[PDB]
């Protein structure tokens, strides 16, 4: 294509890591996350993996091994209809909810859930969950942004607040939470609390329903069909925090068919590739039409 990469160029090309090629994995960040103090020997560094697809939220607790990464427990936003959120799966309150579920789900299966209650109050105030005296120390987990920007008020820190208010120790600071004012040099907990329950989404339903009925009909069409009122948003999340902290345990999907049935179908749409002998036919055949006139 006039760029025409020479045989010599290709030969002296060194490939980046696979995950660097596909551009998923930052290995400058991953070296610093995973690396364990070596006088602490086999003690794992536990990451809080938060990721955002377009339609879903991924929250994973992850440790590392030479043979592979190993996840302790996982929580997705698509589980949230079980606890009462049927909408806004990619919004902030969803992250806070998903962060709380993974906070609760893990330390439950860790036997640390009863101790280290978490907050349960939710005024949106900055605190770590600090260790019990004469008792186990809180489960420590470190925030893994991935390739996400660090911006003040980014959804990923909604996951952070959810998990820290969930009782896990996930050290952090205020300034990337909504409500932090540079000039004021402080966090206003009001606005932060608002975002935990979706105050920013609800005020939009009201100003939109008032100013534009049609545009409002389009974005919130699911809310009109579900008879969900604008200011009822706080009760959907408040009550979801109940059921989540009530039943953190992960229930898997009901799994129509089986892994075997899926496989006998899900890709037999795979193109099976040719044998060497079939290839000698294709060569000798492709001869014919060009041998052909010439």
């Amino acid at each position: 294509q006039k760029d025409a990469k020479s045989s010599a160029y290709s030969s002296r090309f060194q490939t980046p890591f696979r995950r660097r090629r596909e551009g998923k994995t930052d290995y400058y960040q991953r070296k610093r996350l995973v690396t364990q103090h070596k006088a602490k020997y086999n003690t794992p560094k536990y990451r809080l993996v938060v990721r955002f697809t377009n339609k879903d939220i991924i929250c994973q607790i992850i440790s590392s091994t030479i043979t592979g990464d190993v996840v302790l427990a996982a929580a997705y936003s698509h589980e949230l209809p079980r606890y009462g959120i049927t909408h806004g799966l990619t919004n902030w309150a969803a992250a806070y909810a998903t962060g709380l579920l993974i906070a609760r789900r893990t330390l439950q299966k860790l036997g640390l859930d009863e101790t280290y209650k978490g907050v349960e109050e939710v005024e949106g105030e900055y605190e770590l969950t600090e260790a019990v005296e004469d008792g186990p120390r809180p489960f420590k987990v470190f925030l893994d942004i991935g390739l996400q920007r660090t911006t003040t008020g980014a959804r990923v820190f909604g996951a952070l607040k959810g998990a820290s208010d969930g009782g896990l120790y996930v050290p952090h600071s205020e300034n990337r939470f909504p409500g932090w004012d540079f000039e004021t040099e402080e966090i206003d907990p009001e606005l932060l609390r608002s975002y935990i329950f979706g105050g920013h989404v609800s005020q939009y339903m009201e100003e939109l329903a008032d100013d534009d009925e049609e545009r409002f009909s389009e974005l919130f069409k699911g809310y009109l069909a579900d008879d969900i009122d604008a200011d009822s948003l706080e009760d959907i999340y408040t009550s979801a925090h109940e059921a989540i902290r009530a039943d953190p345990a992960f229930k898997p999907t009901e799994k129509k068919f089986t892994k075997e049935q899926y496989a006998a179908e899900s890709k037999k749409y795979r193109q099976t590739k040719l044998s060497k002998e079939e290839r000698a036919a294709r060569v000798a055949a492709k001869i014919a039409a060009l041998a052909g006139q010439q």
Binding site: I287, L290, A291, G292, Q293, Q294
Partner: protein, 209 residues
């Protein structure tokens, strides 16, 4: 100046070519390495004779030039300016030094060049038609007297300047596996993309015979 060539005859030193470290070296006294009909087609000149070195030594760039001229002259005058292709197979990339107070700090400034030659390495090469063997031989034979040490003149089973002792070449010639390049040829590959291989060697395929 030009101290005798007895002094630099033997390879006593690590190769010391013109480099970023060594500059201010003189020009080679041999420039032209191809003479005769140099654009003649590979088929023109089947017969290949070599001037081969039987020693391990350094040849001066001055003596390359002297013997180059020496061969070319007897070739053109006898058999004609177009009857042969003379290619010097050796290049003077090695720098001699002269000291030119005391032995104090005696490192040399560059005195001239020479070409490092090995046992059996080829120095001169000529291709002609078979009818001209005698003449080329006497050309090289006349040019041996310009070189130090012993060099042998070898009739080479091979086609021209290529490779592939003449029977083997002839099989590819009436094949279609031979495409004439400038002064040289390219050989049909069974490796590269089948598309441009058929356009590159239309005579082989196709029609294939």
């Amino acid at each position: 100046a030009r101290r005798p060539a007895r002094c630099y005859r033997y390879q006593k030193n690590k190769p010391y070519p013109k480099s970023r470290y060594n500059r201010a070296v003189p020009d080679s006294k041999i420039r032209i390495y191809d003479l005769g009909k140099k654009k003649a087609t590979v088929d023109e000149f089947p017969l290949c004779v070599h001037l081969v070195s039987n020693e391990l030594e350094q040849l001066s760039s001055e003596a390359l030039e002297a013997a180059r001229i020496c061969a070319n002259k007897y070739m053109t005058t006898v058999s004609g300016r177009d009857a042969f292709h003379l290619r010097v197979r050796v290049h003077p990339f090695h720098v001699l030094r002269i000291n030119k107070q005391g032995m104090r700090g005696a490192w040399g400034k560059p005195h001239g060049l020479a070409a490092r030659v090995d046992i059996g390495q080829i120095i001169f090469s000529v291709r002609t038609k078979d009818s001209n063997k005698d003449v080329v031989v006497e050309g090289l034979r006349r040019a041996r007297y310009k070189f130090p040490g012993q060099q042998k003149i070898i009739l080479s089973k091979k086609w021209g300047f290529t490779n592939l002792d003449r029977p083997e070449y002839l099989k590819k010639r009436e094949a279609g596996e031979v495409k004439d390049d400038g002064a040289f040829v390219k050989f049909l590959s069974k490796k590269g993309s089948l598309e441009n291989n058929i356009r590159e060697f239309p005579e082989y395929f196709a029609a294939q015979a």
